[PDB]
């Protein structure tokens, strides 16, 4: 396989990034700094993950003592809910912008449809628990991330959590100036997203799939959640090709024509997730994996579910 994919602004984006969700921030600069030494060229990083400065403080060691190139690498982040406004989604751009030490970001996503009452929570409730909206809509908001491309601060914007006829409201918005690149979902054996993926694939719209390995250390893990890396149907097909299961994992939406982007903090881990480009999945590995589906998600929250946008009903 190609080590990256061609996106409908012109850049290529490596198919393998490093994700950051949940990364203690006294852990993940040095793990951002192996994995750029043992060759990982993608981070996937979000605001509201309050660890973008660490993140930031390995990517700039790294340029520094010239194991790479900045064009080499290819930094995505998030806009958080409670900045759908037209006036705060470039100081939230900058804020993160800031935190990674860098001037440009390869790719900014909405980080979720459903915009919420600004101010410092980034979930603000009434007082029954009820997430309190924002009347401001994702047409409005989606203007404001083109915006951010024509100022130079990102080279691709993108949409994330955006449901079928949320992309299509993008894709048909009156005036619309740049298609969305990416749309980043939740994506892994047991929520394969095959209608929201064709649609979107269809449309040029390069996925990428999050919680790749089932997001085993999500805060509101229940222990009789189902598991993924431990799932003996992955493993048999891993030890076949005397690869892990997280290898596996990871090829799976490599072979989709999917960007993936699992998370570690543990150095051996960060190298063993990318070495996963001198094995081919044969296409009946493929349709084994997608069969697995159960329409689970990691990402879902109660408190929004009202919304008027919320994605999931
Ligand atoms: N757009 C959105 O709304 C969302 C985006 N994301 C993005 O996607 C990324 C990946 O998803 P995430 O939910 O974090 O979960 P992942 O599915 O990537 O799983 C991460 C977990 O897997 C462990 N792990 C990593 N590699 C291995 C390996 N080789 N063997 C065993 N265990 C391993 C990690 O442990 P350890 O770190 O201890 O090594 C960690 O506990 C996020 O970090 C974030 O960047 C995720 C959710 C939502
Ligand atoms: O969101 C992430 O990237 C990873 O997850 C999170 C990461 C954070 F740093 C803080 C909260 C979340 C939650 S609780 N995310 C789920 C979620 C948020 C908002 C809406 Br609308 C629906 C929803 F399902
Ligand atoms: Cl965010």
Same mark, same amino acid.
């Given at each position: 396989?190609?080590?990256?994919? +061609?996106?409908?602004?012109?850049?290529?984006?490596?198919?393998?990034?490093?994700?950051?969700?949940?990364?203690?921030?006294?852990?993940?600069?040095?793990?951002?700094?192996?994995?750029?030494?043992?060759?990982?060229?993608?981070?996937?990083?979000?605001?509201?993950?309050?660890?973008?400065?660490?993140?930031?403080?390995?990517?700039?060691?790294?340029?520094?003592?010239?194991?790479?190139?900045?064009?080499?690498?290819?930094?995505?982040?998030?806009?958080?809910?409670?900045?759908?406004?037209?006036?705060?989604?470039?100081?939230?751009?900058?804020?993160?912008?800031?935190?990674?030490?860098?001037?440009?970001?390869? +790719?900014?996503?909405?980080?979720?449809?459903?915009?919420?009452?600004?101010?410092?929570?980034?979930?603000?409730?009434?007082?029954?628990?009820?997430?309190?909206?924002?009347?401001?809509?994702?047409?409005?908001?989606?203007?404001?991330?083109?915006?951010?491309?024509?100022?130079?601060?990102?080279?691709?914007?993108?949409?994330?959590?955006?449901?079928?006829?949320?992309?299509?409201?993008?894709?048909?918005?009156?005036?619309?100036?740049?298609?969305?690149?990416?749309?980043?979902?939740?994506?892994?054996?047991?929520?394969?997203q095959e209608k929201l993926i064709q649609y979107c694939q269809s449309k040029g719209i390069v996925v990428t799939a999050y919680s790749p390995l089932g997001?085993?250390?999500?805060?509101?893990?229940?222990?009789?959640?189902?598991?993924?890396?431990?799932?003996?149907?992955?493993?048999?097909?891993?030890?076949?090709?005397?690869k892990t299961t997280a290898q596996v994992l990871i090829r799976f939406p490599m072979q989709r024509n999917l960007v993936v982007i699992p998370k570690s903090?543990?150095?051996?881990?960060?190298?063993?997730?990318?070495?996963?480009?001198?094995?081919?999945?044969?296409?009946?590995?493929?349709?084994?994996?997608?069969?697995?589906?159960?329409?689970?998600?990691?990402?879902?929250? +109660?408190?929004?579910?009202?919304?008027?946008?919320?994605?999931?009903?």
């Amino acid at each position: 396989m190609a080590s990256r994919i +061609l996106l409908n602004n012109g850049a290529k984006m490596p198919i393998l990034g490093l994700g950051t969700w949940k990364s203690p921030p006294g852990q993940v600069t040095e793990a951002v700094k192996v994995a750029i030494d043992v060759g990982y060229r993608h981070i996937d990083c979000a605001h509201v993950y309050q660890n973008e400065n660490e993140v930031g403080v390995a990517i700039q060691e790294k340029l520094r003592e010239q194991v790479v190139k900045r064009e080499e690498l290819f930094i995505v982040s998030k806009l958080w809910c409670t900045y759908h406004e037209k006036g705060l989604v470039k100081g939230a751009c900058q804020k993160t912008l800031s935190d990674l030490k860098l001037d440009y970001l390869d +790719l900014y996503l909405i980080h979720w449809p459903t915009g919420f009452k600004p101010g410092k929570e980034f979930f603000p409730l009434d007082e029954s628990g009820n997430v309190v909206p924002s009347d401001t809509n994702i047409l409005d908001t989606w203007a404001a991330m083109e915006e951010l491309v024509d100022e130079g601060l990102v080279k691709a914007i993108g949409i994330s959590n955006f449901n079928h006829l949320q992309v299509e409201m993008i894709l048909n918005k009156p005036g619309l100036k740049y298609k969305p690149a990416v749309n980043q979902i939740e994506c892994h054996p047991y929520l394969t997203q095959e209608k929201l993926i064709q649609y979107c694939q269809s449309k040029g719209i390069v996925v990428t799939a999050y919680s790749p390995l089932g997001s085993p250390d999500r805060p509101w893990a229940k222990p009789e959640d189902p598991s993924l890396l431990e799932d003996p149907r992955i493993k048999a097909i891993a030890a076949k090709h005397n690869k892990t299961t997280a290898q596996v994992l990871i090829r799976f939406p490599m072979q989709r024509n999917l960007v993936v982007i699992p998370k570690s903090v543990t150095p051996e881990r960060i190298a063993e997730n990318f070495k996963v480009f001198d094995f081919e999945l044969s296409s009946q590995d493929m349709t084994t994996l997608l069969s697995y589906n159960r329409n689970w998600r990691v990402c879902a929250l +109660l408190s929004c579910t009202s919304h008027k946008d919320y994605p999931f009903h």
